[PDB]
Amino acid sequence: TCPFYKKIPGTGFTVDAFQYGVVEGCTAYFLTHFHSDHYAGLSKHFTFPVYCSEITGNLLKNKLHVQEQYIHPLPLDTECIVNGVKVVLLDANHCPGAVMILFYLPNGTVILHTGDFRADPSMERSLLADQKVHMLYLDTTYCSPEYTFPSQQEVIRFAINTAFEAVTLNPHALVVCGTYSIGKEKVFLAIADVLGSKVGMSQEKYKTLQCLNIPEINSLITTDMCSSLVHLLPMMQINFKGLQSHLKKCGGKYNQILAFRPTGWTHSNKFTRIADVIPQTKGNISIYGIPYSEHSSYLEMKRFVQWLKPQKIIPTVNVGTWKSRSTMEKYFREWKLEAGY
Ligand code: NI
């Protein structure tokens, strides 16, 4: 049965709420982005209206085989009406096609649902600036002060310099990037760009990238592994076994692998600057752990919330346990007392 935090009060609307069968009273199902925990339950068998970004709709059509009649894509940054309610979709700075949703309720209440997001200062000069927001449905993935991480740009610069040096040193080395969902594409696109290469990958992965409205994408990606010095593999294969095995498959065309594993936070973020990072190595294979986050750090989340000054916060992540809920309520209370709302 559908939880309160996926319901929008005073509408027939739900968010990211497809795994409970038919939700009684729901007249429109929003989907914030194409990640499986959020789309869970959607299939070609779904026959109610789904509202989402154009990218998310392309994915729904092509990967999930949801029928076109049920897919209602909306442009971003544009005031639209849905079932007689005014709504706006905003860029979430998460994965391709991910959005936050602004609901302007008939009674005059304004609600922001962040979906999944990485808070940024640019969000402070959006349509959010134009009026008070009363309720915030918040991505609390890293809502604890230990969660720090570098900027996406620091990480990319690091990846670029590292790959360029290794391949200029050994022109027969192969660059491999690990992947499991959409998101974090800039890792492999920036590396490929500095090496003058396309990125090679499986047919299933190519098909996914072809739905994302990336400019000039046909000149950036290919299913011909032979013709490419940056390859994508499933994240599960980024280990010394998987990478040796892959190296055998390429027909001796390369004699070395340099691999990247973009992770979230893991415990060593507590000490190490990006400049100090060093790989695990076994022989002619070297693996780098890089902390590329598409969720807010604790400090990013705190700044956004203290700017927005909402009357109520409703978490959407880590809600299944009392300890978690209680911990998060303590931070929200500190933030409020500090900022004076
Ligand atoms: Ni997500």
UniProtKB/Swiss-Prot annotation:
Induction: During mitosis. The mRNA encoding this protein contains an internal ribosome entry site (IRES) in its 5'-UTR. This 5'-UTR generally suppresses translation while specifically promoting expression during mitosis, when cap-dependent translation may be impaired. Expressed in brain, heart, kidney, liver, pancreas, placenta and skeletal muscle. It is found in: Nucleus. Binds constitutively to TP53BP1. Binds CDC27, which is itself a component of the anaphase promoting complex (APC). Binds PIAS1. Belongs to the DNA repair metallo-beta-lactamase (DRMBL) family. May be required for DNA interstrand cross-link repair. Also required for checkpoint mediated cell cycle arrest in early prophase in response to mitotic spindle poisons. Possesses beta-lactamase activity, catalyzing the hydrolysis of penicillin G and nitrocefin. Exhibits no activity towards other beta-lactam antibiotic classes including cephalosporins (cefotaxime) and carbapenems (imipenem). This is DNA cross-link repair 1A protein. It comes from Homo sapiens (Human). The lineage of its organism: Eukaryota, Metazoa, Chordata, Craniata, Vertebrata. The chain holds residues 700 to 1040 of 1040 of the full protein.
